[PDB]
Amino acid sequence: KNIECIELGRHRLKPWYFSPYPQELTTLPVLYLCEFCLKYGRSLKCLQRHLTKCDLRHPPGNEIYRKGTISFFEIDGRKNKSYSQNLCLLAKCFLDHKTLYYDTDPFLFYVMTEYDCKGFHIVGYFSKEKESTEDYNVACILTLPPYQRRGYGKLLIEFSYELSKVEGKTGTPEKPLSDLGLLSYRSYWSQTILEILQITINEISEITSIKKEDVISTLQYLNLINYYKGQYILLRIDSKCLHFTP
Ligand SMILES: CC(=O)SCCNC(=O)CCNC(=O)[C@H](O)C(C)(C)COP(=O)(O)OP(=O)(O)OC[C@H]1O[C@@H](n2cnc3c(N)ncnc32)[C@H](O)[C@@H]1OP(=O)(O)O
Ligand SMILES: [Zn+2]
Prior knowledge:
With 246 residues, the protein is α+β, with helices and mostly antiparallel strands. The protein is 30% helix and 22% strand.
């Protein structure tokens, strides 16, 4: 673990893990990040100078969802390489591993923001492989620490499933899940399935885009397993505001 402190807009962030930022930036008291383009540098003065030329004020890509103060921006990792590359460097501060951190081409990124009079503030994101042989509808998911324990993680997961629905597919997060990932998914899966509550798990899976194995591990967790004749038997996203084209 190499970076002790990150400043991102109004927040001080405390990394959990090593992230391969330039080695000369890993021995500083504070690594300064532009909160809009996620550019990193060695001092507050260069940041203030930067903020003078930095146009953005939100993430790149297209604003495919907006409801109240919450937006989602869809960002092609190939079309917006330096932003996505900067996002991955930050994300790795809170991820145990991040495979292919340096190559953002294979991925889409869904960045969730909170809007106020100062701009669109990055709250968290999830990535997704453009092509997955394993039907992984999320590769990495993150809520930045200042926003954690507030329902944002479950909102990101819900949005990931809304995308799968439009694609007419079931999806599942990339494995292995971190323990924080599993706690979040378990909670989202549980609330979704109870909300549905006779129905078959095939029907649950078709309605929610959740893989059957995930519905089963969840009913197991909820002590709601009922195996009958070969068969298992039992902050929100408004999908009208979603404008997504697979
Ligand atoms: C596929 C992958 O990427 S695996 C990688 C998973 N991501 C990471 O580990 C990155 C670091 N962690 C994070 O960014 C966050 O912890 C996330 C995204 C996993 C969860 O974000 P949050 O915004 O805190 O989630 P949210 O507030 O919606 O909580 C969801 C559920 O998880 C539980 N949870 C979240 N964090 C914790 C924690 N540290 N300890 C115990 N439970 C937790 C919540 O209590 C909630 O459960 P409940 O509905 O039963 O009350
Ligand atoms: Zn910037």
